[PDB]
Each structure stands twice: as structure tokens, then as C-alpha cells.
């Protein structure tokens, strides 16, 4: 049924584009060390988190962080969004968040339409430095992280249409046991913590909400398979 | 008397900031870097116009032009560069890692001058544009300091800053004019006859020779400004 097809999709987050082509397809990608990110300067929000066998999401780090000031990265910068600061920005955090997280996988939304201007520069950075080594992973043969490019609020309009806020969407994950904490630090700041509480949320719905459609996507694409 | 109008007009005369008081433009005209003036690959960012101008400047303080060109990124190119029209954030990666490989290993510059190209309504809307150049422009900035920590200069001019100059200088004349005059002035010569082709023959297309001058305005503008900061860093400290 073409229709069962595109609930499939709109369960894996993937286009509503036949269909069977894009469910088998779909890379299967790690879902171990997972790093949610929601881009920000003075937000800057990121949830690290693995799938474990019950399909439930732990979280290992959990923080949002203000570039310009001290902060849990270490990340010293003064704000000045010349191209040359941007630079200088973006490579201490693609060096930071190898090197503290050592991810498998890192998720990034898009965005969307000055301060629009300043976080797409960061953003067009991170994915320079990112591709120039994922060219190199592949012409020696070694396996690199996945820096995957999610389109705008797409994990949030998912989780919206599953659950039918976004604070109020994750507490539920929360209470629901989806979400458990490897740590008492994030749980902890979760629940008091200043910084928004909505843009923490943000980058645990990017995480969990991927985490989902790659665990749907291992109930039809075997499934899918046999329609070929 | 050390008139506050002078020094602005020295920032003017090298491409520097003319805000501030009277005792901030003499530091900033002393303290201005010294940069080098061979090997200086100006590049008037844009993706179906990308032009770039690579020059040195001659003992007799002549811009030698060693080549100069304008490319479309989307068709075939002088560049060397296939790329499928695509403005995707792992599409422009790898366009910006070609266009940064690619410059280096052809020109090897000193010093690299970068600026946007200017709008036109006829190439793109105004979101897509910006979007298309900021880009691209954010890109080839982190590939060149991610290389650098692994040394050519990387700078970002201001467009104001090189049309107010040549327009107090040269003046009403359209860029191409200044340019021609520029070149039968003989301020502006040629170290090959490819180059100087392309802008005698080439002007047909759309604004190519438009596209082309405004690179090598961008180049010989800012070359200038580093020979008049020789003479005005010394001739300033004089008020300090």
C-alpha cells in the first residue's frame, strides 16, 4: 500500500518521495555516542547520548553553553564575528567536540531565515573542517563519524505528531523511562540548572528523535525488502 | 597642523578605517601590518561569476597582472573545477575544498585578498545570494586556518573601502573605464599576453569585463594602499 509506505516514512524521518527504494536504502547508521547538536554562539546546545539494547536512549552529556563567556567546553573565545574570529571559533569547537566526545555520529539542523547570518557561519565552517576530513577517511579506508544534516525542526514536528511543548515533550521521554541518564550531572541541571530550558530540550529531541527513526527504520527495512 | 581631515584622508589613500579621533587613525596607520605585495591572488567571490585577480608589484611600483579571469563554477571553466549545481552544506564543501585546492596549487599566493562580489539581480534573489557567498566566503576562511595550524595571508577587504578609493583617485567612471585607464596609463601591465587577451577580446557575455575589473581593482587597489603605508607609517610617527 502506498500509503503504509509513507507512514514508514514519516515514522523514519525520511522524505515522503518508490518509497521501497528509500526505506531499504536508508544507511544504517551508529547509534552509540551520538552527539545532538542546536546551534548556537551563546547557546550553544548539544546533547551526547547512545541507543541501548531496550532501544532506550542514554545520555551520557548533556549541556548548553555560552561561547563568549567561561564555559563547560573550555572554549576561550572573544565575540567578534569577523570571518578570521569565526575561523578561529569554529576549529576550537571541531577540536573540542572530537576530542572530549569522540562521537560516531553528529547531528545538525539546517536552519532557517544578523544573528541567522552568524550561526550559519559557524555552521558552513563546521561542515568545511568536517568534509575535508571525511575525504580523506575515505581514500585511506578508515572509518570516520557521520556528520549528518537534519532539515529544520524536523526531529521537533516529529515528536509533536508521536506525542501529540518541547520542555514537556522531554520530561515526558523522561518519565516515560525513553530517556535514562548515565549521569546525575545532566539530569540534575535538566531539573534546575542560567540558560533556557527550551534549548537544552532542543538538542535531546534532535538526538532521541533521529535515535527513533533509526530504530523504526529496523522494523521495515527488512521488511520493505521483501516488496522488491 | 595634523588636521583630523588629513589623516582621514590617508586611511582613504590605504584602504583604512577612517573612524575614530585624531590620535586613534595616526596608530592605525603606524601600527598598520606590513603585507607582502608579490604573489597577491584577489578574489571577488561569487559562484557563476567568481573572478580573481593574481598580481605583484613591480620595483617601479607597477601592478604586474600574471593572470586574471572570471568563471562560472556551475559550467565548464578555466578553473578545472566540476561541481553540479547543488547549494547543500556538504554540496559547498566540496566545492569551497576544489576552488581552495585548486588556487593554491596554481597560484600559490602570498597574500589572498578576498571580497564579495557585488549583487546583481539578475543572477540570483537576494536570500539565495547571500546564502550562496557567506557560504562559500565562511568556508574557504576555515580551510585556510585549519591548513594554517597545520604561511599565505588570507584578508577581507571591504568593497567601500576599494571603490572609495579609486573613485577620490580616478575621478562617474564605471570600474571597467577605471581599469582601461589604469591600463593606458600603463599602471597596470601585463607579465603575459593571455591576460591582457581576455580583457581586449573578452567583451561579450554578461558584464564579464565588469566582473574582471572589479577583481583587478580589488588587487591593484590594495597593492597601492601597502606602497603609500611604506611612505605615511614614518611620515605619521612624526605626530607621535
Not at 60 to 74: F, I, M, Q, R, Y
Not at 119 to 137: F, G, I, P, Q, T
Amino acid at each position: 500500500k502506498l500509503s503504509f509506505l509513507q507512514h514508514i516514512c514519516k515514522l523514519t524521518g525520511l522524505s515522503r518521495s518508490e518509497l521501497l527504494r528509500r526505506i531499504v536504502d536508508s544507511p544504517i547508521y551508529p547509534t552509540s555516542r551520538v552527539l545532538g547538536i542546536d546551534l548556537g554562539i551563546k547557546n550553544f546546545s548539544y546533547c551526547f547520548a547512545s541507543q541501548n539494547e531496550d532501544s532506550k536512549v542514554i545520555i551520557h552529556n548533556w549541556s548548553v553553553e555560552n561561547l563568549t563567556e567561561k564555559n563547560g567546553l573550555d572554549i576561550q573565545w572573544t565575540e567578534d564575528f569577523q570571518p578570521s574570529s569565526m575561523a578561529d571559533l569554529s576549529i576550537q569547537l571541531f577540536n573540542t567536540l572530537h576530542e572530549k566526545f569522540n562521537p560516531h555520529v553528529i547531528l545538525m539542523e539546517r536552519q532557517r531565515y544578523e544573528w541567522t547570518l552568524r550561526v550559519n557561519m559557524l555552521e558552513s565552517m563546521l561542515y568545511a573542517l568536517h568534509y575535508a576530513e571525511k575525504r580523506n577517511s575515505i581514500e585511506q579506508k578508515i572509518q570516520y563519524p557521520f556528520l549528518l544534516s537534519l532539515s529544520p525542526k524536523s526531529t521537533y514536528s516529529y515528536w509533536a505528531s508521536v506525542l501529540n511543548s518541547r520542555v514537556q515533550m522531554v520530561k515526558e521521554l523522561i518519565d516515560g523511562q525513553k530517556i535514562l541518564f548515565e549521569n546525575e550531572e545532566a539530569l540534575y541541571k535538566w531539573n534546575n540548572g542560567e540558560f533556557k530550558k527550551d534549548d537544552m530540550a532542543d538538542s535531546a529531541l534532535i538526538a532521541s528523535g533521529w535515535m527513533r527513526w533509526q530504530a523504526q527504520l529496523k522494523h521495515y527495512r527488512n521488511f520493505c525488502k521483501q516488496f522488491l
